[PDB]
């Protein structure tokens, strides 16, 4: 409402989040990215629907985690952290 600070309820499962980055890990690997060819969660994944992704880099909760998270690239290694989605609280 009003300013409507991009937030989510419980785990933003059904609702669609607008954030596309992890709290402090890094940016979110493009779901339809080629590096995710048939990988954990992606838009090019045969389960893209269940994944809850799409042609973008938004954060999601394909596993049903807390706040929609997203992949992140670390020191020569891959990762994924909670996205910086400002909860609604109350
Ligand atoms: N719960 C999301 C897991 C995402 C996997 C990312 C990785 O393999 O680093």
Coordinates of C-alpha atoms and ligand atoms in Angstrom, one line a residue:
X1 CA 0.0 0.0 0.0
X2 CA 1.1 3.6 -0.4
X3 CA 4.9 3.5 -1.0
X4 CA 4.4 -0.3 -0.9
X5 CA 8.0 -1.3 -0.1
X6 CA 8.6 -4.4 -2.2
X7 CA 7.9 -7.2 0.4
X8 CA 6.5 -10.7 0.8
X9 CA 4.4 -12.6 3.3
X10 CA 5.6 -15.8 5.0
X11 CA 7.8 -16.9 2.1
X12 CA 6.4 -15.1 -0.9
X13 CA 5.4 -18.5 -2.3
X14 CA 2.4 -17.6 -4.5
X15 CA 3.1 -13.9 -4.6
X16 CA 5.6 -12.6 -7.1
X17 CA 8.6 -10.8 -5.7
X18 CA 10.3 -7.9 -7.5
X19 CA 13.8 -8.2 -6.1
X20 CA 16.6 -9.9 -8.2
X21 CA 19.7 -10.0 -5.9
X22 CA 21.0 -11.7 -2.7
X23 CA 21.2 -10.0 0.7
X24 CA 25.0 -9.7 0.3
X25 CA 26.3 -12.7 -1.7
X26 CA 26.0 -11.2 -5.2
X27 CA 23.7 -10.8 -8.2
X28 CA 21.4 -13.6 -9.4
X29 CA 22.5 -15.8 -12.2
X30 CA 20.1 -15.4 -15.2
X31 CA 17.5 -18.1 -14.9
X32 CA 17.6 -18.7 -18.6
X33 CA 21.4 -18.4 -18.5
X34 CA 23.4 -20.9 -20.5
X35 CA 25.6 -21.8 -17.5
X36 CA 22.4 -23.3 -15.9
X37 CA 21.9 -25.7 -18.8
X38 CA 19.6 -28.4 -17.1
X39 CA 20.7 -27.1 -13.6
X40 CA 19.1 -26.7 -10.2
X41 CA 16.8 -23.8 -10.9
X42 CA 16.5 -22.0 -14.2
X43 CA 14.2 -20.7 -16.9
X44 CA 15.6 -23.1 -19.5
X45 CA 14.9 -26.0 -17.1
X46 CA 12.2 -28.4 -18.2
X47 CA 10.5 -27.6 -14.9
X48 CA 10.8 -23.8 -15.4
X49 CA 7.1 -23.7 -14.4
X50 CA 7.6 -25.5 -11.1
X51 CA 10.9 -23.6 -10.7
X52 CA 8.7 -20.4 -10.6
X53 CA 11.3 -18.7 -12.8
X54 CA 11.1 -17.0 -16.2
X55 CA 13.1 -15.0 -18.7
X56 CA 14.8 -12.8 -16.1
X57 CA 17.1 -12.6 -13.1
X58 CA 14.5 -12.2 -10.4
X59 CA 14.8 -14.1 -7.1
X60 CA 12.4 -16.9 -6.3
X61 CA 11.7 -19.7 -3.8
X62 CA 11.6 -22.8 -6.0
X63 CA 12.5 -24.9 -3.0
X64 CA 9.9 -23.1 -0.8
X65 CA 12.5 -21.4 1.2
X66 CA 11.9 -18.3 3.3
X67 CA 12.3 -15.1 1.2
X68 CA 12.7 -15.7 -2.5
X69 CA 16.4 -16.2 -3.0
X70 CA 18.7 -16.5 -6.1
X71 CA 22.0 -17.9 -7.3
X72 CA 25.2 -16.1 -6.8
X73 CA 28.8 -16.4 -8.1
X74 CA 31.5 -16.8 -5.5
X75 CA 35.3 -17.3 -5.6
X76 CA 35.5 -19.8 -8.6
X77 CA 32.4 -21.5 -7.0
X78 CA 28.6 -21.2 -7.4
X79 CA 26.2 -20.3 -4.6
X80 CA 22.7 -18.9 -3.7
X81 CA 21.4 -16.7 -0.9
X82 CA 18.2 -15.1 0.4
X83 CA 17.4 -12.2 -1.8
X84 CA 17.2 -8.8 -0.2
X85 CA 13.4 -8.7 -0.1
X86 CA 12.2 -6.3 2.5
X87 CA 9.7 -8.3 4.5
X88 CA 6.3 -6.7 5.3
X89 CA 6.5 -7.7 9.0
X90 CA 3.2 -6.1 10.0
Ligands
LIG1 N1 18.1 -23.5 -2.5 C1 18.6 -23.1 -3.8 C2 19.8 -23.8 -4.2 C3 20.4 -23.2 -5.4 C4 21.7 -24.0 -5.8 C5 22.8 -23.0 -6.2 C6 24.2 -23.6 -6.1 O1 24.3 -24.8 -6.6 O2 25.1 -23.0 -5.6

